[PDB]
Amino acid sequence: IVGGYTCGANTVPYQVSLNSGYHFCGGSLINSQWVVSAAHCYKSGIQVRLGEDNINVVEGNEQFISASKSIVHPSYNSNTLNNDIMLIKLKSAASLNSRVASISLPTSCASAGTQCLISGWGNTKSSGTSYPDVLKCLKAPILSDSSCKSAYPGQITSNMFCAGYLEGGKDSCQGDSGGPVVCSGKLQGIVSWGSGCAQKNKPGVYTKVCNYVSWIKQTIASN
Ligand SMILES: NC(=[NH2+])c1ccc2[nH]c(-c3cc(CC[NH3+])cc(-c4ccccc4)c3[O-])nc2c1
Ligand SMILES: [Ca+2]
């Protein structure tokens, strides 16, 4: 997260860290046994780490659980990143409390101007790499589809939306991929891609979760 602030320990209880010997992507807990992340974060050997703040120090509240299976959307396109969503089923259910809790799926899509909270342990530098130990937060608005398509002509599908600042300086970045974009208590987006990080007129692009709620429910119900 570039231009954000320190969230504060366990203030984003649905945020998870996908780990393979190091933090490589974020995710969101949607129930005690399932996590939603981005398809491009897929790899084998994933350990889901819940209740984290400092990902380099066991401070208490952490729950490390292996993923039993990862389900990448069948229509995920790695070249356009269209349908960049994946579901991860945990080997055992997580113990939910105040520090570890799930976030609700939306019943309707959000409108432009909606203010959302984006969080993660990704790069905090737009020009260089600086990865944080604790969780960073950024409040950002959803931009209009016209501004988004104007910024990324021919690359935005109906399953994506832009959020952020056109002036640059505040944005999600590498390492934040797969993590949550929560607006009015509902998971509306998944950090997916962008051109650089926090560059002027190149806002972040997010997977539009409201377009996948029935797919998520049907997939969870049959697995
Ligand atoms: N500006 C943004 N809002 C933004 C958001 C998410 C991003 N994710 C990435 C990203 C970049 C790379 C390096 C490509 N030269 C790799 C990954 C990546 C992470 C895990 C697995 C595979 C790729 C990214 O998510 N850049 C990103 C930029
Ligand atoms: Ca920790």
Curated annotation (Swiss-Prot):
Family affiliation: Belongs to the peptidase S1 family.
GO biological process, one term: digestion
Tissue: Synthesized in the acinar cells of the pancreas.
Lineage, highest ranks first: Eukaryota, Metazoa, Chordata, Craniata, Vertebrata
Recorded GO MF terms: endopeptidase activity; metal ion binding; serine-type endopeptidase activity; serpin family protein binding
Keyword Hydrolase annotated: yes
Superkingdom of the source species: Eukaryota
Organism listed in the record: Bos taurus
Subcellular location: Secreted, Extracellular space
Stated name of the protein: Serine protease 1
Gene: PRSS1
Cofactor note: Binds 1 Ca(2+) ion per subunit.
Post-translational modification: Subsequent cleavage after Lys-125 leads to alpha-trypsin. Further cleavage after Lys-170 yields pseudotrypsin. A cleavage may also occur after Arg-99. Not sulfated on tyrosine residue(s).
Disulfide bridges in this chain: C7-C137, C25-C41, C109-C210, C116-C183, C148-C162, C173-C197
Active site residues of this protein: H40 (charge relay system), D84 (charge relay system), S177 (charge relay system)
